[PDB]
Design a protein around this nucleic acid. Structure first.
Length: 88
RNA sequence: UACCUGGUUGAUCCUGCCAGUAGCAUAUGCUUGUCUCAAAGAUUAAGCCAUGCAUGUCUAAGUACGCACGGCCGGUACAGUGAAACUGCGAAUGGCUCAUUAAAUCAGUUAUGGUUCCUUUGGUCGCUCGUACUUGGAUAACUGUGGUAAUUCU
RNA sequence: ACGGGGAAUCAGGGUUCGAUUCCGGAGAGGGAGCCUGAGAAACGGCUACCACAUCCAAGGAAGGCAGCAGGCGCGCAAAUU
RNA sequence: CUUUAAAUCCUUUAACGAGGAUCCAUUGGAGGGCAAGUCUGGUGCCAGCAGCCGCGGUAAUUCCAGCUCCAAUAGCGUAUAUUAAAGUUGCUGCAGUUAAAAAGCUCGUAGUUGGAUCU
RNA sequence: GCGCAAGACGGACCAGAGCGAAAGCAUUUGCCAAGAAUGUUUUCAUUAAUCAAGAACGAAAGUCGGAGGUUCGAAGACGAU
RNA sequence: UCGCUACUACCGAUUGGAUGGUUUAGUGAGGCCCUCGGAUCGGCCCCGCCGGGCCUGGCGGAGCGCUGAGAAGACGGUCGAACUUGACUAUCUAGAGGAAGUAAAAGUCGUAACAAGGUUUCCGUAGGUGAACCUGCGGAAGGAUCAUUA
């Protein structure tokens, strides 16, 4: 279900990676963004877990989403997965 | 050696702890003339490991036609030391570690009349009524031809 | 947390420690399955699979120090190829 | 020389080898616990000591140093586990009116405990 | 002042007095079952003491249903300081 | 109670980042055993060709005749390593969102408590308030009365 689920996910999740409070371009954790479903005091109705994707890890999702000229990736020394979006 | 002192209050007697005190082991700092002993990669990682060594073995008495020696006397079947290879035996002990393991291991205690036992010791070993003055084939060391980059390969 | 014989401390009673030279048990990186033999479910024997890691002419081949030394790592913490 | 597989060390022995900073003893202390200074100079609630109580805000018996002396001594300080001290885990042996503490009250199975009496 | 009604509560007597396992328990009268102490030259003959598990009761407030609402009265509302 | 500087643990939407230990269905490397199985290697005769005194040495060919040995490979079972599959579960870790506690600082705001603490204090409940706290009902003295007259 990567078609459907990555379409919904990356649609509403990139749109929630681009404006504000959707964060524009900053290094930030993808988790915080996945649990960020709210825009303008309502949920996006988008609730999805990344477990619904073809990526059994977030590192692989960051392997694909970084390959698309959308995000750039780095790993913090604490071990979180930190992404710096391409402003497109 | 059957032991206690300081700390609550303006002062007192308490309950009561904190702190002091003496060992004991592991670490550690400073210091170190003599001599006897002596633990020592256990704690964390039963984590990982170059290099070298740690299990081989023949008497008189299982098999010698390697000249490898010498060796004497030379038709003596084999004189004698003897590497190797076949055979026999050992390599299950020793050494190291403490991960597992809670009536499991272990200790004391009993049992095998419910079983196995190389070896050592002593017994037994013409008790069977039916080519032998000696039997059969093969294989190793050895000789030689070889292969593979590479082995205690073949 | 391997168990004992024991060790330190002790009036009398106890507490705590026992990996460690003696006895017994267990295991040879993790599990499993065997040959050989009087005696192994052996590891300085074998067969795998996992995890490591060596050589390679890329076809294949060899691995097991919780044996003595010694090296890395870990660490407050431990000796001579 | 001896020792020993071969050496080492010890023992045994010739030769040299002891008068001042040498052939020199150091580690912590010196308010109270706790043994031993109302010393001398520097610091002035700073730097710092101090296990605990405490010391330090211009005469510091407690800091930094010099002098003195005191404890063990070829040894003595730290940190940590642990034993005694601890009659502060109490079987020997503690406690529970007010200090920490007796259940709101009674019934009740196990558990624990049980009167005399038989030469 | 006369009558009527409703719901509460039993003054004084009431005490360092009584009764109950403890909470607690005071108007009269009857009914119902208990109970201690006392008395006993009655009977059974150790049936007993204390109690984990487990059970019975448990002031006030509080909570659900019902009835009832006089007094007092948290909440609330004023008036003052 | 607040409000400033730090402190910790504490829960907590989640994904991470690590792992670790288990269990279902589907498989199953290898051994050991079971019936097979028989590449090829031996003897026995079947004969010839030769030699020695029926016996005996060769050689050659066959007769799938007989028999003995027997490698690879395969069926089945078994022991069972380790895989795929989902379902599980305990740690660390970061943890967005919070909590609360503490430790300070003469900032507030008060004055609850200790005297009869200025309205006795405290207990259990229940409601209410910026904050201590206040008020109902029932209790205690740890009360401010060991006592009050027929």
């Amino acid at each position: 279900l990567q078609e459907q689920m990555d379409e919904l996910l990356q649609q509403c999740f990139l749109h929630a990676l681009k404006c504000r409070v959707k964060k524009a371009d900053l290094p930030l954790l993808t988790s915080t963004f996945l649990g960020s479903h709210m825009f303008s005091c309502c949920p996006e109705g988008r609730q999805l877990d990344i477990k619904k994707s073809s990526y059994k890890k977030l590192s692989k999702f960051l392997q694909q989403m970084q390959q698309e000229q959308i995000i750039q990736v780095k790993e913090l020394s604490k071990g979180v997965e930190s992404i710096v979006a391409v402003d497109w």
